[PDB]
Each structure stands twice: as C-alpha cells, then as structure tokens.
Design a protein around this ligand. Structure first.
Ligand SMILES: [Mg+2]
Ligand SMILES: [Zn+2]
Ligand SMILES: [Zn+2]
Lengths: 51, 65, 293, 94, 257, 56, 44, 101
DNA sequence: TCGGTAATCACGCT
C-alpha cells in the first residue's frame, strides 16, 4: 500500500527520485592497451554510432 | 565430433593418420612407437591425436529431419 | 598487453579451430483461446491492423505464419506473425475506427541485439485444445577480444590481443606458443600445480601414455623430470627461444608446456549495449531495466 | 605504397609508409646503418590494431648528403643482395 | 654465399646457408609465411545438409583442405593477385564415410593434395550437397592461405675438453641423435645441427670446461610444406617477392621529389 | 587577480553558450571547430569580456 | 496446407484449423522440414 | 590508469555516459580530466602511476651491466615517443664494441 | 536496576 510505495529500500526517495535511470550511456568489458596516452580511452565503433 | 583436419598450432594434416592409428592400438601395441612409426615429429602435432573423443557416433543416430 | 590478468592467444590458432563455440536460444509462441469464444489465429499480418510493429520485417514468413528453416534472422526480425482478437471494440471511436473493426497486433520477435540462423521449427498441440510452436535459432560466435578464459587452477583472464603467427616468440624446434601467459601471476598466487602439469603435458605427449595425476596416489614429482630428461629436453621445461619481430635469442630460457584450459560463457556479445532514447516506464516515464526491455 | 611525409627539415626526414610492415621496415633499417654518413635510422609501428600497415620511418644525416639520397642508394643493395643468393640457391640443388 | 643440402624428402628439407646476416634471415622467414600465395576455398553454397554437423562446420573443413597451386601458370610475385576461381562441387548420399578424394574439380590443376581426409560421416537416407569456390589469397589475411612453415636456428660448436670427467658419455649420446663429432687428443667438437639438451651432471661445467661458440653467418633452415607447393619452389618464390617488393620503393621515392 | 578553478570553468561555460546563440566571434576562425573549442582559444589570449564578482 | 514431417519419419500434409495428429504413427508432434533453396555461408 | 578505478581485466564492466549541453561539457573538460588527478586527497602521494611491468622493467634497464648495442638504443628512442635529433652520443664504453650504457 | 517494543543489514546484472 501507500507507505510501501513511498518507502521500503526501493521506494520513491532512493529508488526513483534521487537516483534515476539515465540516457546516452553504454556498458561493456575492458581490455588493456599501452599505446594510447594517459587521458584517452578506446570506444568501439558500434557504441560510437549509437551515441 | 570428428578429428580436426589441421593441427591447432602446426599446420599439418592429421585426419588421414588417426583411423590408421587407433586400429593399431586396439591390438595392444604401445602408442609411443606407433606415432613414431608414422610422420609425427614434434609434440604439438602429437597432443591432438593422443587426446580425442570421436563422439560422432552417439549424436548421429538421434536424428533430426 | 597481457598485464594484470590478460592473455594473448595466437591469430592463426583461433583461425584453425581453437574454442569455436556455438550458442542456442528458443522461442515459445502459442495460440490461446479466450473465454468469450473468439480464438486468435496466427497468419501474415495485413497492412491495416492497429499497433503495427513495422514493415519489411516480414520477409521470411510463409503463408500461415511459420518461418521455413535456415534463414538468417537478425536484429528485430519477426518469427511468427500473430493476430489478436479486437479488445474493446467500442471505447475509442477515433474518427475512422468504427468502420475498420480490425485487430490489435501482438507477435514474437528476436531479442534486439542478437543474430543467427534458425535450426528447427516445432509445431504441436498442448493439453487443452490450443497450439504452440517452438522455434530455435543458433549462432557461430568466433572467439574475439573480451572472451573470458580460465584454467582449472584459478588463473582467470581475458584475451589481451590477437597477435599474428608471424610475430610470435618461437623455440629451437617447430613450436610456436598459443597463450603467452603473464609471468607476474605464477609466483604471486601459489599455484605450483600449474607448473607441475606443464611438465606433465610435455612428458605425457612425448611418451605416449596419459599421465595419471590423481590426489595423494598419483604420479610423483621427481619421476616425471627424469622421463623428460631422457626423451630429449632439459629437466625443467626451459628452452632456447628466438623473438619473431627482430630475431635473436632472448638471453633467458623461456618456460613452455601443455596446460588444459577451458572457455567460459562470460562472452562479450551478451554484455555490450547502448541506449540513446528508448521506451520508458508507464508510471514514472523513466527508462526501463535490462537489455531485453 | 605512397610515402606520406610529415616533417621535413635540415638533414632530417620523417614520414609514414603505407602498405609496409615489420618485415620490410626492419630489413631497410639495419641495411641503412651500414652507411657511415647515416647518423640515425629507425622506425616504429604505433598501436597494431588501428594501424599496422604504415610504419613511421626517420632518417637523419650529417649534412654531407641528403636523407633521400642515402635512402635511395641503400635500397639498391638489398635488390642486388637478393639477386645474389637467388642465383646461388638455383645453381645448388643439383 | 654457399649452400649445403642436408636432406630432401617429400614435404621437408633442411639446409645450411652461409654468407648472410641476422636481419636478412627474418626477412626471408616472414616472407614465406605472409607473402607466398596459395589457393583455398573461400565460400560454399549449401543446397541441403541433413548431417549431424552444422552448416558452418562443414564449410569450415572445406577451407582447411590443402589445394595444389601450379606455379608455372599464373604469377606468384605480383602485387595484384589473380582472381581466377575454380568450382568444387559434390553430390553424395549415405550411408558411408565421405572422403576428400570424391570432390570433383572443373580444372585439373587445382585438386586436394591429400585424398584420404574424412570430411563427415553419413547415416541412412541423409544427403549432402554443396558448391565450393576457390581463389588466391595470402596468409596475412587468413590462416587458410598458408603454404607451410619455416624454422631456423644458429649454427654452433660445443667444445668439450678431455679434462671433464666422463666426457665419453657425451660422445655416445651425441651419436645417438646424429650430431657429428670430430675427436682429437686435445678435445672434441660437437656441431649442433639440432637442439642439444645438456644432461644435468655437466651443468657445473657449462662455461668452465664446456663452452659454446657461435659460427658467424651460418644458419640451419628447415622448411616443410603440406603438399600445395614443391619443397624447392618455396624459397625461390619468396626471394622473387623481396626483390619486387623492395624495387617499388625506388619508383615511389623518385615520384616525391 | 588569478582566477580559481571554479571560476575558470564557469566563464568558459557561459561564453561557449553565447558563442552558439549568435554573439560574433573574435579572431578564432580556422577551418572548423566545435563551439566549446572556440571559447578555449579566446581565453588564452586574455580577451574575455566576462568578469567575476568577488563577494567580500 | 503445408508439408510437415513428424518424428519417426513420415509425411503428413494436412492444413491448420482443426486437429494436429499423425494418422500412421498416432503421435502429435511435428518438425517443419528444411527447404531446397540455395543459401550462402562464408568459411571463416 | 588502473589504481583509481581499482579494476583488473578478468571480465569487468565499465560504463561511460556522454554529457551534452554546452555548459555541462566545458565543465567536464576543465575540472575532470585525468592529469589533474595524478595525486590523491587521502595521502598526497601519487595514485596514477606505474604497475607490474613498469617497475620490474625499470630494474633491467638500470642494472650495472645493462649495455645496449647501437641498434637497440636507436630502436627504443623511436618507440618511446621522444623526438631527439642525431644525438644518441657519445658511445661511452667502446671496450668491446661501440655501445652505450 | 529492569523489561520491553520497533528499525536498521554493499554495487550491478539475469
Ligand atoms: Mg574485476
Ligand atoms: Zn601442434
Ligand atoms: Zn508419423
């Protein structure tokens, strides 16, 4: 009921208001290369064409 | 899963020398001299004759049209 | 590239057969009957009907609504075309919907990141009276980067890169290694059974007989290193190796053996996703959860 | 095989070489070394997944000869040296 | 520059090359792997496959069959590879094991080198039909187009003075593996035409009494193929590429200026 | 009169947003540049018009 | 109409409106057979 | 840059997210780039620094007896970024052959 | 002292 919709460790202060789901992101695995500089990053070309 | 026709490191054919190999180990002869009698020199050719499953028989009979 | 638990598999050794693994799924679309008396039949959807998924996703279906096998289904391609029954004929009257009287399209389609080819289509009837079709589509899945390997001693890792056969540090025989494992992980995790097995692969491939290695009664340690020492090699695995980029003996004796690895299903094509702007929550209008939604 | 120059200065030449790899690059490097007028010959491949066909070459001279002239005559020798060995090989399997 | 042919066998050869240097040997070695072209099946069109194996797996084995490549009829030193295609068809019906030798070729010069390779086992009533298309390619693009292997080693001499206890044990040991030994009253010289694993008792004498001296400029080469090219053509074809490859450089250099 | 690290990242932020909404640019041209990169070149030569207020 | 092939071989071309059985076998389970068209798989 | 993230490479998962508006993007570049974070606020000492091979490679370079020949000096100065002219000079120990330290 | 009741207990993903 109402008090469990407002609350309950996944309610509507932490679950949906102060932590939200976002747009324009991606998530995959990591794998080294010591040939780029210290402040660069690789990005795959599949993720690069959908952002 | 029939024998791989190459090795996995040394490019060399093997599937002609597996069914001649196993029919001479079911007589009791030691495999250390059978593989030497054929054309197997290194041990990168030789780890993939000596360890295999020949599982094509079981799956084949089960059938799917 | 093989630093901090990576590994560097050969290129030509992937490309001849190592760890080429297949992946299957299945789909279970059916034909239900509601309690009103109207039963929804599945067929080819016509252009009119409300709630159309799209067009030119229906190029693989047959007449009745079943994919004839061995077709490269990919993306969001459909699998079985389902027509549903009206669902509140008189609520809306949206200026042309009184005369149309049609149906509200629901269907089944592959999960929007995969690929592959169908294998076999089932069609039957389940207990009551209905009908349910099962379709399964496979995949080929070559081992590229990301794909987690592991031993049975606990040396997990990921393919670092995929270097060609020509640039491989090779040995004073016909040996060209496959997995150039990082040397900074063996005298840090105390896995001496890795190094005993590496001699046990070289002994039991040259001798002919697969070395027993069970706990507490297996083959002892010292008796292996004499059977290798009389078959033509140094007592500790170490061999003379020439680098492949320039070509001169590396002034050390690089260790080399045969270790049984095994591939794991934390493969990379089931992890990568990107979302620009997708379908949202009904209650809050915030994005959804999971890659399947 | 189109030479893509980058830097050009006095007694110095840096450039990219499309279509080549480690095989040719290393052979041309140490062959160049044999010329006493060549002060500095070297190459690098940068990040061999995004590019592995254009080594970056660098040739530096002492001013008594231009970098292009040094390179030119030093890749003559390799053509002549291969021409030798080949003749030897053929007339030996007999 | 000189050569010494140790042995010639079907699909193998070992020889000693003199008068060369360290950079040149790698250039010769890598060229045999990444430059020499051979023919290989590149795509297969399926009409039906009732076997126990997947479509991809049967297509994968066809690519791994070594095909004869007649070097006296096309061009192996070209920079632009010929696109001539040979069609390999098959129409069989079980039961029985299907062999590589049953594939028919539209051109008698491109056939499988080894006819005793089993491809797939077929049960009662199962049919297998496909068309294979072969084209020229290089090993650098795909491993299936590799003509064989090359391995090389230095040439060294191990000097064993007679002051080493039980030196007689090394003479018999070396003779078992075929390494030449020249003996004199002062010492013995072992020519290491192949790897020489030093037995454990003599490790403390490696450097003091027993020492290894490298012979400048001599290399022992081993070349083995799989039957797609003769064991004598290989080295000649690779040398003719190096010449052609390092001549284009001169042409391109002049164009810049 | 040196700027902090919080004021330097706000003056660029307001100037990169004006430079997208009109507001004719100073000598900043070459060949193609995203509106963020135009504000970085202007701040180096010290021709920023925008000044801070220091409450004290 | 279709041409479905069941388990334990046999052909059974019927329809799809009423019932799904095999007359000869007596079972009710069906695989749809593969067509006889030409597709194109590369060897990698 | 893998002591800040506290990661390793046994199949982990890292997520990026692009910032969009022109105020929130020029704020990301000035205040959050990697090189501003080379030292850490917990103890002052550096955090983004060398790891496993970067240490034990550096011992083999500075041992007494690490004498590189002429080809290997000239090859490695091209690979490590730097741009120097014809000055690998002056062949400090010519006792065996003309090779550097 | 002394008994009583709630209110609390990683991150992400399938
Ligand atoms: Mg981790
Ligand atoms: Zn092998
Ligand atoms: Zn039946």
């Amino acid at each position: 009921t109402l008090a469990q919709r407002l609350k309950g460790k996944e309610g509507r202060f932490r679950g949906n208001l102060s932590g939200k789901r976002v747009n324009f992101s991606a998530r995959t695995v990591i794998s080294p290369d010591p040939m780029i500089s210290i402040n660069e990053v690789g990005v795959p070309l599949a993720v690069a064409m959908e952002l | 899963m029939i024998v791989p026709v190459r090795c996995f490191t040394c490019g060399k054919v093997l599937a002609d020398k597996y069914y001649e190999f196993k029919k001479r180990v079911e007589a009791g002869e030691d495999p250390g001299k059978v593989l030497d009698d054929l054309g197997v020199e290194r041990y990168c050719c030789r780890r993939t004759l000596l360890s295999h499953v020949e599982l094509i028989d079981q799956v084949m009979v089960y059938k799917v049209y | 590239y093989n630093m901090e638990d990576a590994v560097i598999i050969n290129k030509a050794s992937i490309e001849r057969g190592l760890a080429r693994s297949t992946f299957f799924r299945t789909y279970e679309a059916e034909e239900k009957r509601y309690l009103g008396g109207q039963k929804d039949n599945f067929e080819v959807p016509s252009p009119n009907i409300q709630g159309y998924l799209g067009e030119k996703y229906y190029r693989h279906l047959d007449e009745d609504g079943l994919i004839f096998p061995e077709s490269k289904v990919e993306g969001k391609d459909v699998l079985v075309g389902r027509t549903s029954p009206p669902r509140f004929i008189e609520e809306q009257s949206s200026l042309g919907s009184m005369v149309l009287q049609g149906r509200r399209e629901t269907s089944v389609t592959v999960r929007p990141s995969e690929k592959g080819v169908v294998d076999k289509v089932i069609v039957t009837e389940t207990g009551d009276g209905t009908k349910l079709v099962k379709v399964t589509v496979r995949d080929l899945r070559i081992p590229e980067l990301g794909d987690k390997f592991a031993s049975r001693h606990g040396q997990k890792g990921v393919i670092g890169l995929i270097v060609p056969q020509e640039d491989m540090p090779w040995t004073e025989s016909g040996i060209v290694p496959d997995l150039i494992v990082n040397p900074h992980g063996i005298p840090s995790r105390m896995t001496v059974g890795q190094l005993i097995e590496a001699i046990g692969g070289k002994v039991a491939s040259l001798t002919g007989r697969r070395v027993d290695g069970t706990a507490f009664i297996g083959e002892p340690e010292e008796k292996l290193r004499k059977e290798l020492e009389e078959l033509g090699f140094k007592h500790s695995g170490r061999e003379i190796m020439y680098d492949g980029i320039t070509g001169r003996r590396l002034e050390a004796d690089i260790f080399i053996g045969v270790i049984y690895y095994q591939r794991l299903h934390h493969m990379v094509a089931d992890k990568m996703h990107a979302r620009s702007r997708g379908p949202v929550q009904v209650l809050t209008k915030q994005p959804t959860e999971g890659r399947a939604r | 095989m189109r030479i893509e120059v980058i830097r050009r200065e006095e007694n110095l030449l840096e450039f990219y070489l499309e279509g080549e790899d480690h095989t040719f690059a290393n052979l041309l490097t140490e062959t160049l070394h044999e010329n006493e007028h060549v002060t500095f010959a070297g190459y690098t491949i940068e990040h061999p997944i995004t590019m592995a066909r254009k080594p970056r070459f660098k040739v530096v001279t002492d001013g008594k000869i231009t970098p292009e002239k040094a390179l030119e005559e030093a890749a003559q020798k390799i053509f002549d040296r291969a021409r030798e060995v080949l003749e030897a090989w053929k007339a030996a399997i007999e | 520059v000189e050569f010494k042919i140790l042995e010639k066998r079907p699909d193998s050869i070992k020889f000693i090359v003199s008068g060369v240097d360290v950079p040149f040997a790698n250039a010769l070695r890598r060229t045999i792997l990444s430059e020499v072209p051979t023919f290989a099946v590149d795509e297969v069109e399926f009409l039906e496959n009732d076997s126990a194996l997947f479509d991809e797996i049967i297509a994968h084995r066809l690519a791994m069959i070594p095909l004869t490549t007649p070097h006296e009829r096309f061009s192996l030193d070209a920079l632009e590879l010929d696109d001539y295609t040979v069609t390999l068809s098959l129409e069989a019906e079980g039961p029985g094991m299907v062999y590589s030798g049953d594939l028919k070729s539209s051109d008698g010069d491109v056939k499988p080198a080894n006819p005793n390779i089993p491809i797939v086992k077929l049960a009662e009533g199962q049919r297998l039909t496909f068309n294979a298309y072969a084209r020229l390619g290089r090993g650098k693009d795909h491993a299936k187009w590799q003509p064989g292997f090359v391995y090389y080693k230095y040439l060294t001499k191990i000097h064993v003075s007679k002051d080493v206890p039980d030196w007689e044990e090394l003479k018999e040991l070396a003779e078992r593996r075929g390494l030449p030994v020249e003996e004199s009253d002062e010492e013995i010289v072992i020519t290491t035409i192949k790897a020489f694993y030093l037995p454990r008792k003599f490790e403390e004498h490696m450097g003091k009494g027993i020492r290894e001296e490298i012979v400048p400029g001599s290399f022992v080469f081993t070349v083995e193929t799989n039957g797609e090219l003769p064991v004598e053509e290989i080295v000649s074809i690779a040398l003719k590429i190096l010449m052609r490859k390092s001549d284009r450089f001169i042409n391109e250099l002049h164009k810049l200026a | 009169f040196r700027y902090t690290r919080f004021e330097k990242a706000r003056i660029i932020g307001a100037r990169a947003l004006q430079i997208a909404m009109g507001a004719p640019v100073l000598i900043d041209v070459p060949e193609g540049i995203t509106p963020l990169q135009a504000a970085l070149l202007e701040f180096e030569k010290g021709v920023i018009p925008i000044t801070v207020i220091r409450p004290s | 109409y279709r041409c479905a092939k069941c388990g334990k071989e046999v052909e059974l071309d019927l329809a799809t409106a009423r019932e799904v059985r095999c007359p000869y076998c007596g079972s009710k389970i069906l695989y749809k057979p593969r067509p006889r068209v030409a597709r194109r798989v590369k060897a990698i | 840059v893998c002591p800040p993230y506290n990661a390793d490479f046994d199949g982990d998962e890292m997520n990026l997210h692009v910032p969009q508006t022109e105020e929130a993007q020029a704020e990301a570049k000035i205040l959050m780039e990697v090189q501003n974070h080379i030292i850490s606020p917990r103890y002052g000492g550096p955090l983004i620094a060398g790891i496993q091979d970067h240490i034990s490679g550096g011992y083999l370079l500075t041992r007494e007896g690490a004498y590189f020949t002429r080809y290997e000096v000239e090859q490695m100065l091209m690979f490590a970024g730097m741009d120097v002219n014809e000055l690998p000079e002056p062949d400090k120990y010519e006792n065996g052959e003309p090779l550097w330290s």
